[PDB]
Amino acid sequence: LYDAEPGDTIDITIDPRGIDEEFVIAAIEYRWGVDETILTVVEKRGDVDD
Amino acid sequence: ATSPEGIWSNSGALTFEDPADDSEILFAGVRDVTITPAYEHAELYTIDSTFRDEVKRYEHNVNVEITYAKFSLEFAQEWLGGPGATATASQDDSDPMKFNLENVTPSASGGFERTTAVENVVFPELPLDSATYGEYEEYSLTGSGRSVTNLADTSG
Amino acid sequence: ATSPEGIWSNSGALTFEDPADDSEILFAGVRDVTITPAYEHAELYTIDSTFRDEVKRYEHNVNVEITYAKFSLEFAQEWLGGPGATATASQDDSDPMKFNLENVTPSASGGFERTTAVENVVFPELPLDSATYGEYEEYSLTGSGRSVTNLADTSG
Amino acid sequence: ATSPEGIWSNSGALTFEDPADDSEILFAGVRDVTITPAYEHAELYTIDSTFRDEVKRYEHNVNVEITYAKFSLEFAQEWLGGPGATATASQDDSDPMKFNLENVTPSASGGFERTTAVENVVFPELPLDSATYGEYEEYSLTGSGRSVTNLADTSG
Amino acid sequence: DGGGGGGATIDGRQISESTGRYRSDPSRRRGI
Amino acid sequence: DGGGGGGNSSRQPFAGGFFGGGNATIDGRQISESTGRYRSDPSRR
Amino acid sequence: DGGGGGGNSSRQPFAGGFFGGGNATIDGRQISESTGRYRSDPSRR
Amino acid sequence: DGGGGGGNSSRQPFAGGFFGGGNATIDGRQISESTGRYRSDPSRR
Amino acid sequence: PQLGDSKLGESQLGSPGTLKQGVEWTVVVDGEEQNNVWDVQVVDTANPFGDYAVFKMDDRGGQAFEAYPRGTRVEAYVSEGTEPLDNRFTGYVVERRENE
Amino acid sequence: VDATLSRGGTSVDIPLVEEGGEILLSSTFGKPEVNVRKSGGSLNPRVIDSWSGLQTFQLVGKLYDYSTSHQLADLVKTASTTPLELQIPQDAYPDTVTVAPAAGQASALTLEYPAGRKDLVDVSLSLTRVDPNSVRGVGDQQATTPTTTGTGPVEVTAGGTTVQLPSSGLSVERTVGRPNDAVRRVPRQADPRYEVKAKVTNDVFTFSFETLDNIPATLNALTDNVFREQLGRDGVTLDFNGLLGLGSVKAIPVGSSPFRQVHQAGRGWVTVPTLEFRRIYSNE
Amino acid sequence: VDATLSRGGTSVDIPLVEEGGEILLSSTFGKPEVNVRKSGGSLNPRVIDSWSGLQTFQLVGKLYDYSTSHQLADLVKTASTTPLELQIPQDAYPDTVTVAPAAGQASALTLEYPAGRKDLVDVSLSLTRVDPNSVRGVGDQQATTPTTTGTGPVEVTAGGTTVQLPSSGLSVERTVGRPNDAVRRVPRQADPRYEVKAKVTNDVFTFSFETLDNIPATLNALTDNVFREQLGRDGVTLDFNGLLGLGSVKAIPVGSSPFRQVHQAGRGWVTVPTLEFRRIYSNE
Amino acid sequence: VDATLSRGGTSVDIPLVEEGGEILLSSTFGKPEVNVRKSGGSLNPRVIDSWSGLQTFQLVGKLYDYSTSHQLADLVKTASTTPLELQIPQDAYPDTVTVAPAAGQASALTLEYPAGRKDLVDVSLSLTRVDPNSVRGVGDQQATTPTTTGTGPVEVTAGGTTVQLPSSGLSVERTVGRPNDAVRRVPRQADPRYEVKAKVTNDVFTFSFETLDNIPATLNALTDNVFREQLGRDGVTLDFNGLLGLGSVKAIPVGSSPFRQVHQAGRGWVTVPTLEFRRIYSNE
């Protein structure tokens, strides 16, 4: 998903999480090394920075 | 079936062949010959029972041991040379010379002629010199064949 | 090839040589001599069979063992001295004396003359004194050669 | 060099000395004597080859074993006492009595007089009583010296 | 029978200090 | 039996050394999570 | 001591491995506390 | 060969246990850093 | 082989090489590739939150630390398999840090 | 007599036979969920036992055909909410216990196909006891070991190049496990709850052999194409060509020591103590 | 011959004796508190040694009665500011050293009462040297081992139900330690400071036996009432009925493997390699 | 016969010989940097291989000269950006490989000078393969081993007091390594990058011996002056006095178990299994 950006939409299916859905991407994080693309979906919230 | 019968050791005729040719390797003057097909037996036992449940064969070989009193330069140089070659010196290579072996014996009152044949006999060590004061040199081989290729009555 | 033939122990002539010179080291009065080239055998099996798949030679050795009844100061002092030297006392060094060895034996009916030669025989221990009441001193050497350098008919 | 020659066991003359004095320790009635300098041999092989590449000496000792039939109170009380002392009872200390050993033997027809000398021979165990019905008591020592100090023709 | 006989403590200060670089970061990414 | 004597009472403490779980603490308090999940001895191979 | 060829040569690295206690770093800096408490090896059993 | 064999039979799982180095997770996510530095087994001693 | 390394007809054209596989990120600093990089993290996010990237590389004698003054341009390009390089992040340095 | 492991209509009998006096069945019992207090002012600690306990079964036995061995591997690896029932042929145990493959373990099952033996397979199982009414889940994934009737050499294929493993000294060890299932404590059942997950399993093939001929060509063909190249998202195609009845599997070497070349003093050949491949995603 | 271990009026002599050539005394010296720098621009690190060192003793010996063994256990487990003095019968050591049980260990002392060996107890002790003037604390807690004169079987009682452990192959190992004491570095002297704590100790009984008759009944009575029930804050009553002169204690099994039932090929009975109980809150 | 290890003009030949059938050369291949996914909804994991692999060599052999043994120690310990080149005398390997001392190890090289065994040194090397074009660093640090022509006893000096180690049963083991170098993964390339650091190395001397006479005086002189004193920034001075050709070195004992006294049943003397010193800062 290097072509993907925030505000784009994507199909996600996860069993046993029970979701089979189309979501807006609120953020993407790419890791090399562990080679993970991390999608934040629907909305993003902070923590102590909020 | 054929009646069991005595066998007289001195009636035996042992021969060695190169498996590349089926050509005879000169060998003579044996005194003792023992050939013994063998397997490892796993003797399996179960829970609770003290009795053996099953027994299984694995890891077959044929133990061959021969004592002989006439030295053969051909046999010794074939052993040194390894497969399909002959040498006057030790060879620094990993292939042992494999001999096909056959022994033939009449039974003691002519009931049968037992032929035993063994494939790919190899010998870990070869006695070259075996001198003892006041004795003819006596040479003992120990080795292992892959399988018995024939055990039959070869009489007419 | 040459017919196999009996070999008479007392017909043998054993000799030792310094590998630095090819000079003879005086040795005599043998009673027993055994020379046995050997390898370890790796009998290798396979995934789905009880039969042997392949067999391979490794770790070559020539077992030399000699029983003899005439003492040699030269042989004993060569052994003490290590390679290329003689000594009258133990030497505190890590190089053993290496002997070249040759044994020559006629066949019992003169059919061939068998020469066996062995390189770099070493003896882990040297018997100096071997006294037994009412007997001549008799000495046993056990040692290991690197390889057989020659095994041939040396007759004309 | 001197021609090899037979050695008659009964021609031998064994002696023991205290290394603190060079004084003789009374010992007699020998039946057997074996003296054998030895080393551990590290027998070394390479990656590529089935042949031995090298052989090296390490831990040196001289094996001494003696069978004898005349009991000595001095030799026994020296052994009990440890170095430079003599005792009638076992001593609870870690120092073994060290004996200098020498044996002298003419060759069987006078070619040489072989002298063997060994430093710091120690015996792990001393047979005090060795009685068998209808026999004289007979004693066997096994021990280890540090080195051969002398092996020479000591004839005139 | 002789054969038979032959039968983390973690410093709260140093975590709190070493993580400081990173705890403050989201707020820096957002200015203040 | 000669090899088995050394072997068995080696294979036993192999499990004793290998199977010990982590138990980290900050300032006297446990920080390892008390996840109620089991683990049991691996296949003998 | 009689089976020590497999025994002693194993008993020693069992102790050596057991004293391989935990240590940890964040970003090059140590986070293991310098609690000056000793451990000494347990009973041989 | 009971000593030498039992030794080699032990040396392999000693190495296997030694490569069993630490890894850690908070709430299912790894906290161990993906530092791309290699380790390889030490001299045999 | 490389040009002039082999005589004509002796060896087949592309050897010893083969088609690219795996994921590669290249970091570009004022138009120059940094070549000791061993990890990359890129974050792209909706407007209440900042986009950012973190790059990790080896250095010697501070020679690479000198390449990244505050405000220096950085670009991170990604390629997977044989696909073309894609400019996935562009920004400016806000912190350079070197530590043991 | 014999031990049965079964799930609905699928069943395997595991002989529970061994040489001499080896351990056939070790069952362990434990309280992993007791809270023994680490401190407090008394000489001995206060305690609380308040949860289900552990019971483990370790079964050692032999199988007399490869087909049954593959059925056992598939039976263990499968994700299903249908209870896996073990029947133990010893009076100290009930006629059936419900089990999971060992609770957190990558190696719940081991199958060894040693060199020099035919129609013998060494089996080692580790199983955790679980409550029969408390097998829970949603997903369902039948595992299948590929099978074929050939007898070609084992072949490792990568980068368009195929390497035949030597027959000489060839030995196969296969391990199987379900480390992503959860076995969980329950307040006042005796046995724990079992959460079956349609998630990644462990399935590993280990080979040992000795390369006797064409040694550089054989070892270098393997190491060049498998170890020194990057394999991307794909991996080795490991094909048994019908040895042990096995077919073709996609796999990869994993970790610091999946392959080793060993050279011994005085031996004119090379030993491979391990060549180890984990099976990868190809169940599409 | 004997080492003497004593605390005020209480004293125990331990024969430093063992078979053949076994280790009787191992003394280990170390510097846990040297700082060797992990990096820096030198070829060889800078260092700083600035604290008390470590000295440890392992004593192996034998005791000739059970009464002395219980005295030794009570002496080692007891909390008191009264210095525990060790006298070593060997010239490489001073006439007395002040000691703590092994500094952080659950098993400072082990006592083994093996099958066959009447009136022999194997002792293994581990002790840390401490500064004689630097034994510090507030609370005294005299430990006690309960004793009785009976000859009955070892009994495990839980849920009103009693199991008798088989006499056949019965061996006892007891281990004792004080892991909650602190042995601490001090800057100016050779030996560390010892902080004696009136806090929880370790005290464990391990049984080993072979179950020969009434095998389901015996093992099921143990596993049902101890391992499958929840024990609450009470536990097993473990009663020696006067074997080794021991009485009765409250105890519990702890952790993943405190009990194992082992079945061997060709044997008509069950081995129990271990059955472990930790002593729990009891004193008043 | 020999393997050759070299650094520009400096070169050492290591015979690669051993007794009987011992391992001379192990080469291990691996993929430390594959990402096998721990979870996901497949039966078998998705994977990605995207980085350089690992290749390691363990070499075992003997040296016939102490001088060469010191050259080998200096060669391994030295920091230089000049490639360290290994030549292996077996046809599977290329004629040269570039290497680092084992990537993260305190013990990359071990030299054993056992009792007996005049002019024999056991060598064990662990080496990691690295890319020949990818050796990087600031600058060199030539390591050296002090040498002298004497024959005196090994002397340990601290607090102005010198202690001679017994000759009886004496063995020396020296270990050397470069744990502060970095061997790093690279994309799209076979072998890792090597970062040579002008930083702290590992260099340790271990002694084993038996004290036979003046036992309290010898062991107390060692323990009082080395172990029971605080040494400060300065080390012990360890002087070989020309044994093995070695000179004088500043060093310190480190950690929990650097020294042991062992007493065995029925023996009138003390064994020292290990006395272990790490070489400290001493370069100007």
Numbering used by the authors:
A (entry chain BF): 303 to 352
B (entry chain B4), C (entry chain B5), D (entry chain B6): 2 to 157
E (entry chain QF): 294 to 300, 317 to 341
F (entry chain QE), G (entry chain QG), H (entry chain QI): 294 to 338
I (entry chain BF): 2 to 101
J (entry chain BB), K (entry chain BA), L (entry chain BC): 2 to 285
What does the paper say about this structure?
Here, we present the near-atomic resolution structure of Haloferax tailed virus 1 (HFTV1), an archaeal virus thriving in extreme salinity. Through single-particle analysis, we obtained near-atomic resolution maps of DNA-filled and empty virions, enabling us to assemble full atomic models of the virus pre- and post-DNA release, including all structural protein components. The full atomic structure revealed that the virus has a length of 1350 Å and an icosahedral head with a diameter of ~600 Å. The tail has a length of 560 Å and terminates into a baseplate with three radiating TFs of ~190 Å in length.
(A) Full structure of the tail consisting of a dodecameric head-tail connector (HTC), a hexameric tail completion protein (TCP), 11 tail tube (TTP) hexamers, a trimeric baseplate-tail connector (BTC), a trimeric baseplate hub (BPH), and three trimeric tail fibers (TFs). The tail region begins with dodecameric gp26 [head-tail connector (HTC)], which interacts with the PP to maintain a conduit through which DNA can pass. This is followed by hexameric gp29 [tail completion protein (TCP)], and subsequently, 11 copies of hexameric gp35 [tail tube protein (TTP)] making up the bulk of the tail. Each hexameric segment of the tail is rotationally offset from the next by 23.6°. The tail forms a hollow tunnel of 36 Å in diameter. In the DNA-filled virus, this tunnel houses gp40 (TMP), a hexameric coiled-coil structure with alternating C-terminal conformations. The TMP extends from the central channel of the first TTP near the portal to a cavity in gp44 [baseplate hub (BPH)]. The coiled-coil region of the TMP precisely aligns with the 11 tail tube rings, confirming that its length dictates tail tube length. In addition, we observe two densities between the DNA and the TMP, located within the TCP and HTC proteins. Because of its location between the TMP and DNA, we name this protein the TMP-DNA spacer (TDS). The TMP and dsDNA are separated by a spacer (TDS), and the dsDNA traverses through the portal into the capsid.
